[PDB]
Amino acid sequence: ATFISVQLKKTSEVDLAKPLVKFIQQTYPSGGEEQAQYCRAAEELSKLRRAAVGRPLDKHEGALETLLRYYDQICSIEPKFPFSENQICLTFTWKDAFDKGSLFGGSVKLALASLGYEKSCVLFNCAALASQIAAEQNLDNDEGLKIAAKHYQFASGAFLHIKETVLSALSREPTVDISPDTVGTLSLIMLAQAQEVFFLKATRDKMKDAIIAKLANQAADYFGDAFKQCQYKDTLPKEVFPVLAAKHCIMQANAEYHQSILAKQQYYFGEEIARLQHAAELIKTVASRYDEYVNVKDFSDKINRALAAAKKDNDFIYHDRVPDLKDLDPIGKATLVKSTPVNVPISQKFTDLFEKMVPVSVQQSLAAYNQRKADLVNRSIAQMREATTLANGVLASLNLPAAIEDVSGDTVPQSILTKSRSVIEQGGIQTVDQLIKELPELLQRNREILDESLRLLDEEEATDNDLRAKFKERWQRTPSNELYKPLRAEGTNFRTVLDKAVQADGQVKECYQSHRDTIVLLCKPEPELNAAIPSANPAKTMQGSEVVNVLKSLLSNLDEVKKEREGLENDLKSVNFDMTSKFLTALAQDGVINEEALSVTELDRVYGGLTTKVQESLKKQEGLLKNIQVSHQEFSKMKQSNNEANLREEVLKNLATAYDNFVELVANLKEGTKFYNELTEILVRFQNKCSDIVFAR
Amino acid sequence: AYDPARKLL
């Protein structure tokens, strides 16, 4: 009993851990327990591939489950690494299963950095191994048949799946063995052989000849189509062609022989004989042309006995006319087989090593989302500040709201006194004197770290160039020069960072030198400060004016409008939406994650209320600034240009500008300090990459 | 004021 099976494809060993850990780390918190398992999974994985492919093969469910498990686990990884860009290069090398190449050289090999290549080959080997285990079943007992039937159908389904994916999964052309046509024929061969197995069960179970005939006929139809496909393309091994021809005939004969029994049971004696003659013709040709692949003697004898006896009853008793074959009805067909669909997991008790790892399409949509959210928040925030800066600068420009608090040109207007006290309580100038003094020191600290860092590289690179010089042979290595190119690139950037930071130091310092005198004045105790603000004769005409009460509450609103920006900015920054689980839903419930529409929609939901209140502020300020500029210049009519009051006005306008500048300056200095301290953190790390690498060398 | 430098990080 000869059944076709397929040989496994050979692959070269390939470091599977390498491109995976590399990325794994580029992706997680170093030392972080993420890496603790994900890197520990890409180990088991490489050790699995070794087992599922490198091993000299053992024809049992053990080695097949390992191979099945390997197919599963590979499929479970595609969405969780950036194979798509393929910038994560790992190369898979497979040989042809049949040594089939268009050009006349035995083995044609093919290596590809396509996980789709890997997938098709593992699956082909899965179908082939299944085909070999099927072919070994004992088709005399009930479980031999069940296992063979299940495996031929599995192989059929796997080969078919390969036929329908292989090209989309590969850029270029496949080796022959796995090309859609070769795998289409193998899938049909496997399906034919599973029909055969069912024909054999039907037989062993002594079912009605009508059934057995239809089963055998169906099998013949399968074997015949596979035969045809092979007739004018020779991409399968040498013994496959004759064997298909043989089994095609032997299955037609079995169909004839069983139908002939049905004919005799119906007294169609002429048909019985015609069908047996056909069966004998077929089996006779098989016996003499494919004796190398097939044994048909028992079948030939059983037919010959039935034909002899049928002819005896007919020649002597029945005298029924024997029909031409062209004139018989077709025998029917009944299929009990299905090529089995591939639906990972195909292995039993599958467990996905990287189940917890986040789909790469989700992490990309999360990052994209944050660049979108930062933009939303920063924009809104910067818009507001600029607007507050503008309004404060305008009010100063108008001596507002000092002017309308200035009842007697004799004392410190209340707004000035409040601002003064506000400044004194935050330390006064000695607060700004400190930050300005310590700024050049935080800068130095960082130059120093960057400098010692790079000196390390310079010094180790030096001895390395010397050693290679005096010991060419015993000191062969990649030069330090080449190894250090990356780190010296970070270095150079860092340098350009310090360039910008210093540039900003200079701007802040020039602002501090140009406003430090007024501020020192602003910080004086009330009487001393008052005695430094020139007196003026206050026009009492102003108390109660229409221009004044309007301006006054026109200014009240402007104040509320700006203390409002404080909560606003604080709310923009204090909220956050974790979008992962919303991205997961879009990916499970759907084929793809469309983040743009998804995040735009969530941003509008989370931030929309504020990005609208913010938006209100600005145009509400515009309304206020417009109304104030006009309503003021009317207050400018009642205004009276006497040099006593002009001096007073100068000084008041300047103290208010001084408050603004104090507030702004302190903020640019705290900012700059936070920056230099973060920079120390980042630079200290960079100094570790440097020493670690000078001492691994 | 130090925003331009944070950008380069």
From Swiss-Prot, chain A:
Residues 417-697 are annotated as: Interaction with SDCBP. Residues 175-502 are annotated as: Interaction with CHMP4A, CHMP4B and CHMP4C. One of its GO terms (molecular function) is protein homodimerization activity. The keyword Secreted applies. Its main location: cytoplasm. The modification N-acetylalanine is found at A1. The modification Phosphothreonine is found at T478. May be phosphorylated on tyrosine residues by activated PDGFRB. Changing F675A: Loss of interaction with SDCBP. The keyword Protein transport applies. Changing I211D: Does not support cytokinesis; loss of normal midbody formation; loss of CHMP4A-, CHMP4B- and CHMP4C-binding in a yeast two-hybrid assay; impairs rescue of PTAP-type L domain-deficient HIV-1 p6; no effect on localization to the midbody. Keywords: Acetylation, Apoptosis, Cell cycle, Cell division, Cell junction, Cytoplasm, Cytoskeleton, Host-virus interaction, Intellectual disability, Methylation, Phosphoprotein, Primary microcephaly, Protein transport, Secreted, Tight junction, Transport. Residues 2-391 form the BRO1 domain. Transmembrane segments: none annotated. The modification N6-acetyllysine is found at K214. Changing I682A: No effect on interaction with HIV-1 p6. The modification Phosphoserine is found at S480. Changing F675D: Abolishes interaction with HIV-1 p6 and EIAV p9; abolishes rescue of PTAP-type L domain-deficient HIV-1 p6; no effect on cytokinesis, nor on midbody formation. Multifunctional protein involved in endocytosis, multivesicular body biogenesis, membrane repair, cytokinesis, apoptosis and maintenance of tight junction integrity. Class E VPS protein involved in concentration and sorting of cargo proteins of the multivesicular body (MVB) for incorporation into intralumenal vesicles (ILVs) that are generated by invagination and scission from the limiting membrane of the endosome. Binds to the phospholipid lysobisphosphatidic acid (LBPA) which is abundant in MVBs internal membranes. It is linked to Microcephaly 29, primary, autosomal recessive: A form of microcephaly, a disease defined as a head circumference more than 3 standard deviations below the age, sex and ethnically matched mean. Brain weight is markedly reduced and the cerebral cortex is disproportionately small. MCPH29 is characterized by small head circumference apparent at birth and associated with global developmental delay, impaired intellectual development, speech delay, and behavioral abnormalities. Affected individuals also have poor overall growth with short stature, mild dysmorphic facial features, and seizures. This is Programmed cell death 6-interacting protein. It comes from Homo sapiens. The gene is PDCD6IP. The chain holds residues 2 to 698 of 868 of the full protein.
